[PDB]
Enzyme design. Structure first.
Site, PDB file in Angstrom:
ATOM      1  N   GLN A  38       5.867   8.028 -10.436  1.00 34.01           N
ATOM      2  CA  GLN A  38       5.404   8.917 -10.150  1.00 34.01           C
ATOM      3  C   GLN A  38       5.939   9.568  -8.443  1.00 34.01           C
ATOM      4  O   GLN A  38       6.213  10.396  -8.321  1.00 34.01           O
ATOM      5  CB  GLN A  38       4.219   8.523  -9.523  1.00 34.01           C
ATOM      6  N   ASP A  64       0.792  -1.022   0.062  1.00 32.07           N
ATOM      7  CA  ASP A  64      -0.303  -0.070   0.523  1.00 32.07           C
ATOM      8  C   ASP A  64       1.238   1.154  -0.135  1.00 32.07           C
ATOM      9  O   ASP A  64       0.034   2.799  -0.193  1.00 32.07           O
ATOM     10  CB  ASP A  64      -1.276   0.034   1.201  1.00 32.07           C
ATOM     11  N   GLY A 110       2.095   4.997 -12.716  1.00 32.44           N
ATOM     12  CA  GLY A 110       3.227   5.593 -12.033  1.00 32.44           C
ATOM     13  C   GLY A 110       3.378   3.591 -12.027  1.00 32.44           C
ATOM     14  O   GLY A 110       4.269   3.775 -12.453  1.00 32.44           O
ATOM     15  N   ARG A 111       3.328   2.452 -11.149  1.00 33.03           N
ATOM     16  CA  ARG A 111       3.492   1.181 -10.931  1.00 33.03           C
ATOM     17  C   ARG A 111       3.041   0.463 -12.920  1.00 33.03           C
ATOM     18  O   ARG A 111       4.070  -0.033 -13.098  1.00 33.03           O
ATOM     19  CB  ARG A 111       2.429   0.829 -10.326  1.00 33.03           C
ATOM     20  N   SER A 112       1.936   1.510 -13.051  1.00 29.18           N
ATOM     21  CA  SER A 112       2.383   1.199 -14.799  1.00 29.18           C
ATOM     22  C   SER A 112       3.533   1.708 -15.184  1.00 29.18           C
ATOM     23  O   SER A 112       4.138   0.345 -16.471  1.00 29.18           O
ATOM     24  CB  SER A 112       0.817   1.306 -15.246  1.00 29.18           C
ATOM     25  N   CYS A 133      -3.056   0.573 -13.214  1.00 31.26           N
ATOM     26  CA  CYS A 133      -2.876   0.355 -12.158  1.00 31.26           C
ATOM     27  C   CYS A 133      -4.196   1.431 -11.579  1.00 31.26           C
ATOM     28  O   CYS A 133      -5.116   1.273 -12.075  1.00 31.26           O
ATOM     29  CB  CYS A 133      -1.283   0.687 -11.175  1.00 31.26           C
ATOM     30  N   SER A 134      -3.821   2.158 -10.380  1.00 33.40           N
ATOM     31  CA  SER A 134      -4.587   3.562 -10.585  1.00 33.40           C
ATOM     32  C   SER A 134      -5.337   4.428 -11.636  1.00 33.40           C
ATOM     33  O   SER A 134      -5.985   4.666 -11.229  1.00 33.40           O
ATOM     34  CB  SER A 134      -5.363   3.926  -9.089  1.00 33.40           C
ATOM     35  N   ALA A 135      -4.169   5.127 -11.205  1.00 32.82           N
ATOM     36  CA  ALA A 135      -3.934   6.552 -12.317  1.00 32.82           C
ATOM     37  C   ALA A 135      -3.730   5.465 -13.437  1.00 32.82           C
ATOM     38  O   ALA A 135      -3.966   6.340 -15.177  1.00 32.82           O
ATOM     39  CB  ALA A 135      -3.521   7.801 -11.770  1.00 32.82           C
TER      40      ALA A 135
END
Ligand SMILES: CC[C@@H]1[C@@H](O)c2ccccc2S(=O)(=O)N1CC(=O)OC
Ligand SMILES: CC[C@@H]1[C@@H](O)c2ccccc2S(=O)(=O)N1CC(=O)OC
Length: 284
Positions: A262, A181, A220-222, A215-217
């Protein structure tokens, strides 16, 4: 400069923040006018994360062609990726319309549906074989075929049916379930194992449409997933693997979607992943 030496040089000096802000300053700025139209406000998760006009994916419909999604096309590596936000309650039908229209064979999910006690994306796939999903706005049916749950990731087989033509396809859902998280993983070993499973499936290969990565946005992870994959492919293709410059690849990718990577911690993690992954690429 060999990136592993550049790595120890930045670590020994704690210059990850310095390097990260230099990338932010040099990154491309292109218009995103379609994303900002008032009719599209409930199609965007975050007011500050939008697809550029020149690289956005268009939905094949006359009503409204907008989705928060970008085509990242890497010319020298000969790889393409679609990077998108986690689907919203009112864009799950658009999401699957895009997978259908772009001829994608894989979806790569790098988040949990709930993180930090808040919803990060809709429950957009079926959890039980006998409870399929119908998306009435886009005329698609989605069925869970099988599920393989491992310690660090889950792989699912989905049937997507175009209800208009009764054509069907096999979609591979690759779900990385253990990104923490807060912060980044301590070791890149499980993320690299996951990347190699997506590669082995054919989902990244030129006989298919581009992989959909979220990912969420979707930055970042993407961003970490596509940056690591393209850098390792370039190390394999070139006469001098030491010539691959991760900062220059990231700025090339930022021509096609804003904000990729990010935090300074995500930038350091991307360097670690490429350095450790190369000890396979170079023959081990
Ligand atoms: C933003 C934090 C970042 C961090 O990635 C890190 C991690 C391990 C070792 C060193 C560093 S760091 O020092 O380069 N750094 C900048 C720093 O501390 O604030 C100026
Ligand atoms: C086109 C969707 C189809 C799906 O209905 C199904 C059914 C049984 C076993 C696997 C699969 S699947 O998802 O892999 N798939 C392609 C396939 O292999 O043909 C059987």
């Amino acid at each position: 400069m060999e990136m592993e030496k550049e790595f120890e040089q930045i670590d020994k000096s704690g210059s990850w923040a310095a390097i990260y802000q230099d990338i932010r300053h040099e990154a491309s700025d292109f218009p995103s006018r379609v994303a900002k139209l008032p009719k599209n406000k409930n199609r965007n998760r975050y007011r500050d994360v939008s697809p550029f006009d020149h690289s956005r994916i268009k939905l094949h419909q006359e009503d409204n062609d907008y989705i928060n999604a970008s085509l990242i096309k890497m010319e020298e590596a000969q790889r393409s990726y679609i990077l998108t936000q986690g689907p919203l309650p009112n864009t799950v039908g658009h999401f699957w319309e895009m997978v259908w229209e772009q001829k994608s064979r894989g979806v790569v999910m790098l988040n949990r549906v709930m993180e930090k006690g808040s919803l990060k994306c809709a429950q957009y796939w079926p959890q039980k074989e006998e409870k399929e999903m119908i998306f009435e706005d886009t005329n698609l049916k989605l069925t869970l075929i099988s599920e393989d749950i491992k310690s660090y990731y889950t792989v699912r087989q989905l049937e997507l049916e175009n209800l208009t033509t009764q054509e069907t396809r096999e979609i591979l859902h690759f779900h990385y379930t253990t990104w923490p998280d807060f912060g980044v993983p301590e070791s890149p070993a499980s993320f690299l194992n996951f990347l190699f499973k997506v590669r082995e499936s054919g989902s990244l290969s030129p006989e298919h449409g581009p992989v959909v990565v979220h990912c969420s946005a979707g930055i970042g992870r993407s961003g970490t997933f596509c940056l690591a994959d393209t850098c390792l492919l370039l190390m394999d293709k070139r006469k001098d693997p030491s010539s691959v410059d991760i900062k220059k690849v990231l700025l090339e990718m930022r021509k096609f979607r804003m904000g990729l990577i990010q935090t300074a911690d995500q930038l350091r993690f991307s360097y670690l992943a490429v350095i450790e992954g190369a000890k396979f690429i170079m023959g081990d």
